[PDB]
Structure 1
Amino acid sequence: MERKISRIHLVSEPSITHFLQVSWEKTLESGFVITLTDGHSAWTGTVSESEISQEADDMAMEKGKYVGELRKALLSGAGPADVYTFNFSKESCYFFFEKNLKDVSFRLGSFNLEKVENPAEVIRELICYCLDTIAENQAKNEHLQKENERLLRDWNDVQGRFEKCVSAKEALETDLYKRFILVLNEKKTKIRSLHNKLLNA
Structure 2
Amino acid sequence: MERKISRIHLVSEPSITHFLQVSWEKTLESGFVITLTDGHSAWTGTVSESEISQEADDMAMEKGKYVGELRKALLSGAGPADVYTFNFSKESCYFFFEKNLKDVSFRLGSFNLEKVENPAEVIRELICYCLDTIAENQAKNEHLQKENERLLRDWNDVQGRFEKCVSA
**What is the TM-score of this pair, normalised by structure 2?**
0.76
Larger-Rg structure: 1
- 1:72–1:33 distance in 2 versus 1, CA, 3 Å: same
Q: Is the 8 A contact 2:71 2:77 kept in 1?
A: no
Instruction: Report the alpha carbon displacement of residue 27 of structure 1 after superposing the two structures with TM.
Output: 6.2
The question of whether the paired residues in 2 share the 8 Å contact of 1:19 and 1:34 is answered with no
Question: 2: CA distance between counterparts of 1:97 and 1:109?
Answer: 5
Q: Percent identity between the aligned chains? A: 100
Which stretch shows the higher mean deviation, 98-107 or 142-151? 98-107
User: 1:127: Cα distance to partner?
Assistant: 1.1
1:14 aligns with 2:9: no
Structure 1 residues 104, 92: closer, same or farther in 2, change over 3 A?
A: same
State which drifts further: 119-128 or 108-117: 108-117
Contact 2:8 2:20 in 1 (8 A): no
Describe the SS at the equivalent of 2:106.
coil
1:113 aligns to what?
113
Structure 1 residue 142 displacement after superposition: 1.3
Distance 1:40 1:6, change over 3 A: same
Instruction: Give the whole-Å Cα distance in 2 for the aligned partners of 1:94 and 1:80.
Output: 28
Contact 1:93 1:114 in 2 (8 A): yes
> Are the equivalent residues in 2 in contact too, given 1:85–1:98 (CA < 8 A)?
yes
* SS of alignment partner, residue 34 of structure 1: strand
Offset of residue 91 of structure 1: 0.9
2:96 is aligned to 96
Residues 76/116 of structure 1: CA separation in 2 closer, same or farther (3 Å cut): same
Query: Could you say if the C-alpha distance between residues 15 and 25 of structure 1 is closer, same or farther in structure 2, counting changes exceeding 3 Å?
Result: farther
- Give the whole-Å Cα distance in 1 for the aligned partners of 2:163 and 2:123: 60
SS state at 1:43 partner: strand
Q: How many residues align?
A: 168
Deviations 1:107-153 (A, max 9, x none): 22211112213221111111111111111111121112110111100
Kept after mapping to 2: 8 A contact 1:59/1:101: no
Tell me the C-alpha RMSD between the 2 structures: 5.4
Q: Say which is worse superposed, 122-131 or 54-63, in terms of deviation.
A: 54-63
- The match for 1:40 is 40
After superposition, where does 1:1-201 map in structure 2 within 5 Å?
1-13=1-13, 19-24=19-24, 28=28, 31-47=31-47, 61-76=61-76, 80-99=80-99, 104-167=104-167
Maintained 8 Å contact 2:20/2:37: no
- TM-fit CA distance, 1:2: 2.8
**TM-score with structure 1 length normalisation?**
0.65
Unpaired runs of at least 5, structure 2 = none
Structure 1: gaps spanning 5 or more residues: 168-200
